[PDB]
Design an enzyme around this catalytic site. Structure first.
Site, PDB file in Angstrom:
ATOM      1  N   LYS A  63       0.823  -1.202   0.000  1.00  0.00           N
ATOM      2  CA  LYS A  63       0.000   0.000   0.000  1.00  0.00           C
ATOM      3  C   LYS A  63       0.862   1.258   0.000  1.00  0.00           C
ATOM      4  N   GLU A 102      15.985  -7.868   6.692  1.00  0.00           N
ATOM      5  CA  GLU A 102      16.404  -9.205   6.400  1.00  0.00           C
ATOM      6  C   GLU A 102      15.623  -9.683   5.193  1.00  0.00           C
ATOM      7  OE1 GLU A 102      16.436 -13.650   8.543  1.00  0.00           O
ATOM      8  OE2 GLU A 102      15.743 -11.883   9.636  1.00  0.00           O
ATOM      9  N   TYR A 103      16.365 -10.258   4.263  1.00  0.00           N
ATOM     10  CA  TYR A 103      15.819 -10.926   3.098  1.00  0.00           C
ATOM     11  C   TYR A 103      15.415 -12.339   3.504  1.00  0.00           C
ATOM     12  CZ  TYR A 103      16.105 -13.637  -1.285  1.00  0.00           C
ATOM     13  OH  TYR A 103      15.813 -14.485  -2.322  1.00  0.00           O
ATOM     14  N   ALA A 104      14.157 -12.678   3.233  1.00  0.00           N
ATOM     15  CA  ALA A 104      13.587 -13.980   3.554  1.00  0.00           C
ATOM     16  C   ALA A 104      13.336 -14.724   2.255  1.00  0.00           C
ATOM     17  CB  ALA A 104      12.277 -13.826   4.362  1.00  0.00           C
ATOM     18  N   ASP A 154      -2.409  -7.395  15.014  1.00  0.00           N
ATOM     19  CA  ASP A 154      -2.821  -8.350  14.007  1.00  0.00           C
ATOM     20  C   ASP A 154      -1.644  -9.178  13.458  1.00  0.00           C
ATOM     21  OD1 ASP A 154      -5.045  -8.006  11.157  1.00  0.00           O
ATOM     22  OD2 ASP A 154      -5.235  -9.124  13.043  1.00  0.00           O
ATOM     23  N   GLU A 198       0.285 -13.226   5.300  1.00  0.00           N
ATOM     24  CA  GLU A 198       1.097 -12.492   4.322  1.00  0.00           C
ATOM     25  C   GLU A 198       2.258 -11.782   5.016  1.00  0.00           C
ATOM     26  OE1 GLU A 198      -2.022 -10.262   4.871  1.00  0.00           O
ATOM     27  OE2 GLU A 198      -2.690 -12.346   5.075  1.00  0.00           O
ATOM     28  N   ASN A 199       2.193 -11.685   6.341  1.00  0.00           N
ATOM     29  CA  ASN A 199       3.232 -11.009   7.098  1.00  0.00           C
ATOM     30  C   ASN A 199       4.155 -11.983   7.811  1.00  0.00           C
ATOM     31  OD1 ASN A 199       2.388  -8.474   6.273  1.00  0.00           O
ATOM     32  ND2 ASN A 199       0.966  -8.223   7.988  1.00  0.00           N
ATOM     33  N   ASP A 224       6.000  -8.104   9.729  1.00  0.00           N
ATOM     34  CA  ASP A 224       5.418  -6.787   9.906  1.00  0.00           C
ATOM     35  C   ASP A 224       5.869  -6.279  11.262  1.00  0.00           C
ATOM     36  OD1 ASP A 224       2.365  -6.458  11.602  1.00  0.00           O
ATOM     37  OD2 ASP A 224       3.647  -8.230  11.725  1.00  0.00           O
TER      38      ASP A 224
HETATM   39  C1  LIG Z   1       6.440  -8.709   4.391  1.00  0.00           C
HETATM   40  C2  LIG Z   1       7.612  -7.743   4.555  1.00  0.00           C
HETATM   41  C3  LIG Z   1       7.544  -6.847   5.581  1.00  0.00           C
HETATM   42  C4  LIG Z   1       8.601  -5.929   5.786  1.00  0.00           C
HETATM   43  N1  LIG Z   1       8.501  -4.966   6.890  1.00  0.00           N
HETATM   44  C5  LIG Z   1       7.358  -4.092   6.924  1.00  0.00           C
HETATM   45  O1  LIG Z   1       6.490  -4.157   6.048  1.00  0.00           O
HETATM   46  C6  LIG Z   1       7.183  -3.075   8.034  1.00  0.00           C
HETATM   47  C7  LIG Z   1       6.396  -2.057   7.706  1.00  0.00           C
HETATM   48  C8  LIG Z   1       5.158  -1.798   8.571  1.00  0.00           C
HETATM   49  O2  LIG Z   1       4.832  -2.551   9.423  1.00  0.00           O
HETATM   50  C9  LIG Z   1       4.334  -0.507   8.304  1.00  0.00           C
HETATM   51  C10 LIG Z   1       4.339   0.085   7.035  1.00  0.00           C
HETATM   52  C11 LIG Z   1       3.608   1.222   6.819  1.00  0.00           C
HETATM   53  C12 LIG Z   1       2.874   1.779   7.865  1.00  0.00           C
HETATM   54  F1  LIG Z   1       2.172   2.874   7.661  1.00  0.00           F
HETATM   55  C13 LIG Z   1       2.877   1.193   9.108  1.00  0.00           C
HETATM   56  C14 LIG Z   1       2.054   1.808  10.288  1.00  0.00           C
HETATM   57  F2  LIG Z   1       1.147   2.629   9.802  1.00  0.00           F
HETATM   58  F3  LIG Z   1       1.467   0.842  10.945  1.00  0.00           F
HETATM   59  F4  LIG Z   1       2.879   2.467  11.088  1.00  0.00           F
HETATM   60  C15 LIG Z   1       3.611   0.039   9.331  1.00  0.00           C
HETATM   61  C16 LIG Z   1       9.699  -5.928   4.950  1.00  0.00           C
HETATM   62  C17 LIG Z   1       9.774  -6.851   3.895  1.00  0.00           C
HETATM   63  C18 LIG Z   1       8.753  -7.747   3.690  1.00  0.00           C
HETATM   64  C19 LIG Z   1       8.840  -8.761   2.536  1.00  0.00           C
HETATM   65  N2  LIG Z   1       7.788  -9.006   1.681  1.00  0.00           N
HETATM   66  N3  LIG Z   1       8.139  -9.935   0.793  1.00  0.00           N
HETATM   67  C20 LIG Z   1       7.158 -10.369  -0.208  1.00  0.00           C
HETATM   68  C21 LIG Z   1       7.115  -9.314  -1.299  1.00  0.00           C
HETATM   69  C22 LIG Z   1       7.359 -11.793  -0.716  1.00  0.00           C
HETATM   70  C23 LIG Z   1       9.417 -10.342   1.014  1.00  0.00           C
HETATM   71  N4  LIG Z   1      10.234 -11.257   0.423  1.00  0.00           N
HETATM   72  C24 LIG Z   1      11.493 -11.481   0.845  1.00  0.00           C
HETATM   73  N5  LIG Z   1      12.029 -10.820   1.897  1.00  0.00           N
HETATM   74  C25 LIG Z   1      11.288  -9.884   2.569  1.00  0.00           C
HETATM   75  N6  LIG Z   1      11.911  -9.203   3.696  1.00  0.00           N
HETATM   76  C26 LIG Z   1       9.945  -9.600   2.154  1.00  0.00           C
END
Ligand SMILES: Cc1cc(NC(=O)CCC(=O)c2ccc(F)c(C(F)(F)F)c2)ccc1-c1nn(C(C)C)c2ncnc(N)c12
Ligand SMILES: [Cl-]
Ligand SMILES: [Cl-]
Ligand SMILES: [Cl-]
Length: 256
Positions: free
Chosen positions: A17, A85-87, A130, A134-135, A148
């Site tokens: 988003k 971290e890359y997953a 939550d 997906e997180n 997340d």
């Molecule tokens: C899922 C995933 C999450 C994250 N970290 C976050 O998202 C934190 C951001 C947050 O919590 C946030 C953001 C905006 C916002 F306004 C607020 C509020 F408002 F609440 F404050 C909170 C980093 C990498 C990924 C990721 N995804 N993927 C897929 C594409 C497969 C990957 N594939 C491989 N490696 C990966 N690391 C990934």
């Protein structure tokens, strides 16, 4: 002292988003990582900039193999960057839709990894909001990672009743979260799924769900104990980890 020119950007891992996530390699070290890009104006127009700040703050203090590492962050004029971290093995969400549903051994293992991570967070006075599949990301050996942020100190499917009813909530939301995921892992969809927000709200508040026939007595027992309307009737994580169905089926040792 960090900037975008410090990283070679690879392919989009995923588009969110408030911005996108990219594979990236740090140039000096060749360290492979995930670069999440967030646009300030978006965060601001949503008024969550401060919350982002707090969540990133809390994340920094979290070191656990079942929690995604936050290496650092920075910003330019227009964007915010999270260095993560890359997953390598993707999301549990994607795994679930490839496999349809998980067997009891994968499910109990995942629940165990989550309970351990959450138990470590509870000790640090951290609780989670939550928790969605997906997180949940997967490490190279397929270990689960909470990805997340936030960390306290949209679809309703994963919210506890006290959160949607506007009541006081605590670390017991995490137990609800385990209950919902245990069910989704075994069944292939969360236990209050419905066509409308309006129906889902009712079903959560009522805790109105049923099990398909193939869900075993041991799993029903655990899920029924987590999905209690009254947060105070929910077990401690410490008890999730010692549940006979968890104990009998999980590959991962409990806690530490
Ligand atoms: C899922 C995933 C999450 C994250 N970290 C976050 O998202 C934190 C951001 C947050 O919590 C946030 C953001 C905006 C916002 F306004 C607020 C509020 F408002 F609440 F404050 C909170 C980093 C990498 C990924 C990721 N995804 N993927 C897929 C594409 C497969 C990957 N594939 C491989 N490696 C990966 N690391 C990934
Ligand atoms: Cl009705
Ligand atoms: Cl109904
Ligand atoms: Cl009815």
């Amino acid at each position: 002292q960090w900037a975008l020119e410090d990283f070679e950007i690879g392919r989009p891992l995923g588009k969110g988003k408030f911005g996108n996530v990219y594979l990236a390699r740090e140039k000096q070290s060749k360290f492979i990582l995930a670069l999440k890009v967030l646009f300030k104006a978006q965060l601001e127009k949503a008024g969550v900039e401060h919350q982002l700040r707090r969540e990133v703050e809390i994340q920094s203090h979290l070191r656990h193999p079942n929690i995604l590492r936050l290496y650092g962050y920075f910003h330019d004029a227009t964007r915010v960057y999270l260095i993560c971290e890359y997953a390598p093995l993707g999301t549990v969400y994607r795994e679930l839709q490839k496999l349809s549903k998980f067997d009891e051994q994968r499910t109990a293992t995942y629940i165990t990894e989550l309970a351990n991570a959450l138990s470590y967070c509870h000790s640090k006075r951290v609780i989670h909001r939550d928790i969605k599949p997906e997180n949940l990301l997967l490490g190279s050996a397929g270990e689960l990672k909470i990805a997340d942020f936030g960390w306290s100190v949209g679809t309703l499917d994963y919210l506890p009743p006290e959160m949607i009813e506007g009541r006081m909530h605590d670390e017991k939301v995490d137990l609800w979260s385990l209950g919902v995921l245990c069910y989704e892992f075994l069944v292939g969809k969360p236990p209050f799924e419905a066509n409308t927000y309006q129906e889902t709200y009712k079903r959560i508040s009522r805790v109105e769900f049923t099990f398909p026939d193939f869900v075993t007595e041991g799993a029903r027992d655990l899920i029924s104990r987590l999905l209690k309307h009254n947060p105070s009737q929910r077990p401690m994580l410490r008890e999730v980890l010692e549940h006979p169905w968890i104990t009998a089926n999980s590959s991962k040792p409990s806690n530490a």
